[PDB]
Amino acid sequence: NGDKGYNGLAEAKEKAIKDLKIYGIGEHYIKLIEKAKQVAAVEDLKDEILKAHDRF
């Protein structure tokens, strides 16, 4: 995970922030996915972001 040569990381980040935007997630958290080091971080961040969203 986090392979710079493959586009899997870029596609993972793309679909991750796609989900985020669907849930009305702001850029503050969307940037976290973009700054993710690896796909595992992308998945973990997305979840934690949506938890913070659902946390009221």
Q: CATH homologous superfamily of domain 1-56? A: Albumin-binding domain (1.10.8.40)
- CA 3 to the chain's CA centroid: 16
Instruction: Determine the Cα angle at 43 with ends 37 and 45, to 5°.
Output: 70
Q: How far apart are CA 31 and CA 34, in angstroms?
A: 5
Q: Which residues contact 30 (CB under 8 A, 6 or more apart)?
A: 17, 20, 21
Deposited experimental method: NMR
